[PDB]
Ligand binder design. Structure first.
Ligand code: 8XI
Ligand code: 8XI
Length: 580
């Protein structure tokens, strides 16, 4: 009867309020903390009133009508979010559709900063205000963050301030932890953003196909029907979360977790760990569970998929089932492949049956289908080996620099802070993946590459600048990474006009923390590439080498700024001659 009561009953007040703050922050990314809170309280109050009397006036309205309505009463809508007030003219579902277009993927809000001093004070003060504020901060910053996962991370962020506010050194305990937690927030956010981008750009069928491959890898002992079932449920969960229906999403998620834990023996023996846990933790653990060992009765695939004479007839009768089965079987035995490579492999299998089934003697044509996969596998494997050899040899910073040079040549129209952010995120993929056991390297690098490329595509929908990037971002999810790998120097780019100020440094760079000093160097690297796109990577590396020596030198000078002023213009002119 009352959907609001229903969710309030299912989730409990703590989690309901939490999720509703997340939904509100992400949707209305600008408001102070306390105005989101007042709206959360109003909605929560209304929920309690409905739970006690479901036939109460307004109680039977959809969540969307309810929350859309709330959102549209906020102070100063046409001044904070001028395009957003227009949304308020529309009914549901159009209203919510309108609201979602408006979500902003790069609000570039102040950087989140651990002040172990002032924060610890506020936490001892009112721990509930403190968590709320954290949820609020994250959500507005990552408007698509997996709702129920944010509540998990809030518990973590809380358990940190616990262990570290009593401690002798406040930042001592706390800065590494909050540093770690940031990374996991960014990774988590990038995983979910890929899911919502897949429903947005490619649809539900692509999301299901991705999840079939990935879940078959993780639960290779489960049967097909059990994988389908979980993929069906999981897909609905993320479809809801990506649509801002965080309450339904959380509720369906807990139902999923409970289903998976009641059937753990026919799913995976890695789950027992997860299933012995509390709610949020249990779900988190299932979502991140490692791949089970392979069963020793995995069937030989040739028989059903290459040799059987009725293949074309099972294909023509039931394409989606037949291809799903192939996907499930091939993926469960290839935890050493990336999800996208599995999907590419499934699409080549499909394409081969389309072709062979329309010639005189199909079995003779499709007999070799598994043999056509060999080049598909070898291209990403050797790409991963080349990038990990380079990483191992030059280390992270130079590996970022090499990727910055590579991506700026592919897309020199992209703004400098995006090129640096992506080259840096892709170099951290090396550090994360290159050190793993070698059979883990390929899925690690390729899966994480999908995340960084999709961040590039999300930004590019906001601010399109390149037709080649559009085409890679929108043609096919599974082909993205090879479509990017194949871009080269955009050959009718016109070198960006030289601007001496861009390459001019001052003493301020001397007080920067290490990574901010690197970002300043790596931005001038990408600018060197924009002005001399034909320069070889070996020339750029030399000139950047000269810029760093010049910075180290001037930051050690008695008079930092005279050194910058005296030496800079020489270096800036002679660099251009070196990049010819
Ligand atoms: N124990 C609560 C909690 O600390 N909630 C914080 C707190 O309380 N917050 C409030 C509030 O009551 O003002 C809102 Cl609006 C929603 S939740 C946030 C909790 C909720 C979700 C996950 C973990 C803890
Ligand atoms: N008939 C094709 C097909 O339409 N593929 C389209 C294809 O392309 N899509 C993508 C993609 O963008 O990479 C995925 Cl994940 C699979 S479906 C969709 C198909 C291939 C594999 C499974 C089902 C359908």
């Amino acid at each position: 009867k009352s959907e609001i009561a229903h969710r309030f009953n299912d989730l409990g007040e703590k989690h309901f309020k939490g999720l509703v703050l997340v939904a509100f922050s992400q949707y209305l990314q600008q408001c102070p903390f306390e105005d989101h809170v007042k709206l959360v309280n109003e909605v929560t109050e209304f929920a309690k009133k409905c739970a006690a009397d479901e036939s109460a006036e307004n109680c039977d309205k959809s969540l969307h009508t309810l929350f859309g309505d709330k959102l549209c009463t906020v102070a100063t809508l046409r001044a904070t979010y001028g395009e957003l007030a227009d949304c308020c003219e529309k009914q549901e579902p159009e209203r919510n559709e309108c609201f979602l277009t408006h979500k902003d993927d790069h609000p570039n809000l102040p950087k989140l900063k651990p002040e172990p001093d002032a924060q610890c004070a506020a936490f001892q003060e009112d721990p509930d205000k403190f968590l709320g504020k954290y949820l609020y901060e994250v959500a507005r910053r990552h408007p698509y963050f997996y709702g129920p996962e944010l509540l998990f991370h809030a518990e973590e962020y809380k358990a940190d301030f616990t262990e570290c506010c009593p401690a002798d050194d406040k930042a001592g305990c706390l800065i590494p932890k909050l540093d770690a937690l940031k990374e996991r927030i960014l990774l988590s956010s990038a995983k979910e953003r890929l899911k919502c981008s897949s429903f947005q750009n490619f649809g539900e069928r692509a999301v299901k196909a991705w999840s079939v491959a990935r879940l078959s890898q993780k639960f290779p002992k489960a049967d097909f029907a059990e994988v389908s079932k979980i993929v069906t449920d999981l897909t609905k969960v993320h479809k809801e979360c990506c649509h801002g229906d965080l309450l339904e999403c959380a509720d369906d998620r807990a139902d999923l977790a409970k289903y998976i834990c009641e059937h753990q023996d026919s799913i995976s023996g890695k789950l027992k760990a997860c299933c012995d846990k509390p709610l949020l933790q249990k779900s988190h653990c299932i979502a991140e569970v490692k791949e089970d060992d392979l069963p020793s009765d995995l069937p030989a695939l040739a028989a059903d998929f290459a040799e059987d004479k009725e293949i074309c007839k099972h294909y023509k009768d039931a394409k989606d089932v037949f291809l799903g089965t192939f996907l499930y079987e091939y993926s469960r035995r290839h935890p050493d492949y990336s999800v996208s490579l599995l999907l590419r492999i499934a699409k080549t299998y499909e394409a081969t049956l389309e072709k062979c089934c329309a010639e005189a003697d199909p079995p003779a044509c499709y007999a070799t289908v598994f043999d056509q996969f060999t080049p598909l596998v070898e291209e990403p494997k050797s790409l991963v080996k080349k990038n990990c050899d380079l990483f191992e040899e030059v280390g992270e910073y130079d590996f970022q620099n090499a990727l910055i040079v590579r991506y700026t040549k592919k897309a020199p129209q992209v703004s400098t802070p995006t090129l640096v952010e992506i080259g840096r995120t892709l170099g951290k993929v090396g550090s994360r993946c290159c050190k793993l056991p070698e059979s883990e390297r390929l899925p690690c690098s390729e899966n994480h590459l999908a995340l960084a490329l999709n961040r590039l595509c999300v930004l590019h929908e906001k601010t399109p600048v390149s037709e080649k990037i559009t085409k890679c971002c929108t043609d096919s999810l599974a082909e993205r990474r090879p479509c990017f790998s194949a871009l080269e120097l955009d050959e009718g780019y016109v070198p960006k006009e030289f601007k001496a100020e861009t390459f001019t440094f001052h003493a301020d760079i001397c007080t920067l923390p290490e990574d901010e000093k690197q970002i300043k160097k790596q931005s001038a690297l990408a600018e060197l590439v924009k002005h001399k796109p034909k320069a070889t990577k070996e020339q750029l590396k030399t000139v950047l080498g000269n810029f760093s020596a010049f910075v180290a030198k001037c930051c050690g000078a008695e008079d930092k700024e005279a050194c910058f002023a005296e030496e800079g213009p020489k270096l800036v002119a002679s660099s251009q001659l070196a990049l010819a």
